[PDB]
């Protein structure tokens, strides 16, 4: 076929040529156990689905329909944040405690400023592998970004050690090789 | 005599009634018939005699006698060195102009330029401003109705000269018209370069009326408000006055400590002056009370013999603080113990204290005894929108107070960790304030 031929010829012409160092920061990404614990963290903070939302809405609406106005109390919803402009919006306050960044986006240029932007804003970013795995934890097909701001007190101590873990595993390991021109070796 | 005896418009009469004023202070009772007579004047009066209101009354009389539109002119122009004194003069002037019909405004370096620009585009019938920002607004803002200049006043030319804005003032007066303008000015003392500006300003020939250890506590900028709270709890049932810089931080700290339910009286320029008088009266008669105030609202009124002078914020005039602690000791036979908070950037102030040659006592801090309410503070600020905005306002006005400070050798914004300052206000992230850094 043609499309199989092109998708195999793709990633050959990339690595054969010199990639700029603002790329290939991607795939210098998080290792196995740390990404695993990051997913264990963010599955604790799944956002509400449309079905669960509408279900709670029907519950409270049937409550008010009886009326049976039970109380007026709810702390806040805490969830991951996943809209890209919303993720950037949570930076430049700053509010992002952790950011996950997908390596694979076909318009890469949507994403390329985010490591430098969280670098200058001091936000603990981490480059995650695969936007589908982001979409799974956020009930989308893909997400390509994952910001997290608000955390319960049960999880806040896990958050800080995860931040220190990432800054040890990502910011220390890959920082100098981030500056280097990747690829260029023929296929 | 009395304010209510003299010939006045009825909204000015209602204004003076609601500000609580009936009688006159003697130097202002002297200067008011020349103030109505239309002559230029200079004057020596103590800071806070009511000398704001002294010019405020015939200025509004001139605006009442001319009745011109907001598009028509600006007229009354007020030059005042300190942003804090500007806010105090403005807050006194607001209700006075409010019973009147004309317009009132602010021009301050450190305010939003498009705000002041749009207010100038609308036109303002009574301007109160700092000297430095006026050159920017006169040289840069287009279409601003400048040609009228019904009058002009200077206050504390000693403080303009001591800051050093006098060349800016000369450029201003060379921009200013003279023939319609009359010039009135108050300065408690005088120098030659004051009198040189006076000779340019005063268009007719004027008649003029002329009438110890300190505590110092070095603390980091985050924990200083917490330590103030801790020391205030420990010294409860002792009347103490705390000196601040910005009225927003006064109102915010008062509302905060009342939310922590220990009894606190506030005292600031945004406070209504009858309510201000009520708070001062209740502090003086209650004799075991917490008084939060700025520097110059405290300067504007005599102080009862107190258990503690606490100065939290940087001073407006440190020289006046040195004279003020001396007159506080010599006036109060009851012992008033004076302390100032310090930040480890501020130790040069100490050697200026060593320039003052008065003795100094370092007051030590135990890190064990920390009230540990800062998490509750941050949960409160994340909870309450109203407290969130007042906290941001105290933070903003605090930084603009540092911006408006004279002694750069004692206070540099570049020295300061704004993260710790925000955490003292209770923000984990410092909010953006549009400040030249």
């Amino acid at each position: 076929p043609e499309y199989v031929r092109v998708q195999r010829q793709k990633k050959i012409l990339s690595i054969r040529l010199k990639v700029p160092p603002t790329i290939a920061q991607f795939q210098y990404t998080l290792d196995r156990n740390t990404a695993a614990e990051t997913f264990k963290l963010f599955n604790k903070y799944r956002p509400e689905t449309a079905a669960e939302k509408k279900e709670r809405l029907t519950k409270e609406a049937a409550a008010v329909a009886e009326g049976k106005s039970k109380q007026d109390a709810s702390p806040k919803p805490y969830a991951v944040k996943y809209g890209l402009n919303h993720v950037v919006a949570l930076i430049e306050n700053k509010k992002a405690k952790l950011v996950l960044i997908a390596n694979d986006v076909d318009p890469i240029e949507l994403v390329v400023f985010l490591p430098a932007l969280c670098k200058k804003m001091g936000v603990p970013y981490a480059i995650v592998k695969g936007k589908a795995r982001l979409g799974t934890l956020v009930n989308q097909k893909t997400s390509a970004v994952a910001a997290l701001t608000e955390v319960r007190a049960e999880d806040e101590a896990a958050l800080a050690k995860l931040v220190s873990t990432i800054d040890a595993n990502f910011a220390d390991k890959y920082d100098e090789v981030k500056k280097h021109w990747g690829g260029g070796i023929l296929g | 005599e009395k304010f209510e005896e003299l010939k006045l418009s009825q909204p000015t009469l209602k204004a003076i009634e609601k500000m609580g004023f009936t009688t006159m202070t003697s130097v202002q009772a002297r200067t008011i018939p020349p103030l109505l007579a239309g002559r230029d004047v200079l004057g020596a009066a103590k800071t806070g005699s009511g000398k704001t209101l002294a010019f405020l009354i015939p200025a509004i009389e001139l605006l009442h006698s001319l009745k011109f539109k907001p598009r028509n002119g600006t007229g009354i122009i007020v030059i005042t060195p300190t942003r804090e004194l500007a806010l105090q003069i403005f807050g006194v002037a607001r209700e006075l102009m409010e019973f009147h019909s004309q317009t009132f405004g602010i021009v301050i370096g450190g305010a939003n330029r498009r705000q002041e620009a749009e207010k100038l585009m609308k036109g303002v019938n009574m301007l109160i401003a700092t000297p430095g920002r006026l050159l920017d607004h006169l040289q840069n803002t287009k279409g601003f109705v400048f040609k009228n200049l019904k009058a002009l006043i200077i206050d504390e030319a000693d403080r303009i000269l001591e800051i050093g804005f006098e060349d800016e003032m000369r450029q201003i007066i060379k921009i200013l018209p003279n023939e319609d303008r009359q010039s009135m000015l108050f300065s408690a003392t005088q120098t030659t370069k004051v009198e040189d500006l006076a000779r340019i300003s005063l268009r007719p020939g004027p008649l003029f009326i002329n009438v110890l250890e300190q505590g110092y506590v070095v603390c980091d900028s985050d924990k200083r408000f917490l330590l103030l709270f801790s020391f205030l709890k420990r010294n409860q049932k002792k009347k103490i006055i705390v000196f601040l810089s910005s009225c927003n931080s006064v109102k915010y700290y008062a509302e905060l400590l009342n939310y922590i339910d220990l009894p606190v009286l506030e005292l600031h320029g945004k406070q209504k002056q009858q309510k201000r008088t009520n708070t001062f009266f209740e502090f003086c008669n209650a004799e075991r009370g917490i008084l939060i105030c700025t520097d110059v609202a405290a300067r504007g009124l005599d102080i009862p013999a107190v258990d503690w002078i606490i100065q939290f914020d940087p001073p407006d005039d440190p020289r006046d603080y040195i004279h003020r602690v001396g007159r506080t000791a010599r006036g109060t036979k009851g012992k008033g113990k004076s302390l100032m908070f310090l930040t480890p950037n501020e130790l040069g102030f100490l050697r200026y204290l060593k320039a003052s040659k008065v003795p100094l006592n370092e007051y030590e801090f135990p890190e064990n005894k920390i009230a540990n309410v800062q998490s509750q503070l941050e949960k409160l600020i994340k909870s309450n929108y109203y407290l969130h905005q007042t906290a941001k306002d105290g933070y903003r006005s605090y930084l603009q107070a540092y911006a408006s400070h004279s002694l750069k050798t004692v206070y540099q914004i570049d020295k300061l960790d704004l993260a710790k300052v925000a955490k003292s206000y209770g923000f984990p992230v410092p909010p953006k304030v549009n400040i030249t850094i």
Partner: protein
């Protein structure tokens, strides 16, 4: 323009919880979760009183 039954009942709860004073009911967490404005509270209570309960 009248008032809705839930929110006038909410005002009725506030009227019995705090009474008439506004600085206490402004800093009330329970039954002021929308954190209504100081004077919007006054406006809605005066409309509610003119509607019902003097």
């Amino acid at each position: 323009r009248s008032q809705s039954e839930r929110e006038e009942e909410w005002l009725e709860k506030l009227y019995k919880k705090h009474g008439d004073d506004y600085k206490k009911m402004f800093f009330d967490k329970k039954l002021n979760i929308y954190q209504q404005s100081e004077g919007d509270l006054k406006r809605r209570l005066l409309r509610w009183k003119k509607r019902n309960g003097i």
